[PDB]
Structure 1
């Protein structure tokens, strides 16, 4: 898989796989650090949403 996935972001930032989604949805059940951690990992990983599965799961963005 050439494009990065939310799963890579979760693992990299060192959080649960729900945390990453949680941060993406800007949920209230998320601490500041955790939110910044996942958002940062998006840079290192060069996270580029999996348009294939993402559309299937909803949309090619959010």
Structure 2
């Protein structure tokens, strides 16, 4: 329906886009503190990431 982006979530929560994707796509080095603030952004705007973007950039196979 309406896509949203990692940047839209980031801008809303007042964080970085790498802060966002830690929560979303399960990365490591952020914090538990900031995690929950991103979880709020996802909820408001209703973040749908693009699976296409997740595949294209999602690193090549070694």
TM-score, normalised to structure 1, is 0.70
Runs of 4+ with >6 A deviation: 59-62
Would the aligned equivalents of 1:49 and 1:61 in 2 still touch at CA under 8 Å?
A: no
Mark the runs of 5 or more structure 2 residues left unpaired by the alignment. none
Identify if the C-alpha distance between structure 1 residues 39 and 32 changes in structure 2 by more than 3 Å, giving closer, same or farther. Answer: same
The 2-side partners of 1:50 and 1:60 are apart by 18
Mark the runs of 5 or more structure 1 residues left unpaired by the alignment. none
Q: How many residues align?
A: 62
Bigger radius of gyration: 2
Would the aligned equivalents of 1:51 and 1:61 in 2 still touch at CA under 8 Å?
A: no
Alpha carbon RMSD of aligned pairs, Å?
4.1
Identify if the C-alpha distance between structure 1 residues 2 and 25 changes in structure 2 by more than 3 Å, giving closer, same or farther. Answer: closer
TM-score, normalised to structure 2, is 0.70
SS state of the match for residue 8, structure 2? helix
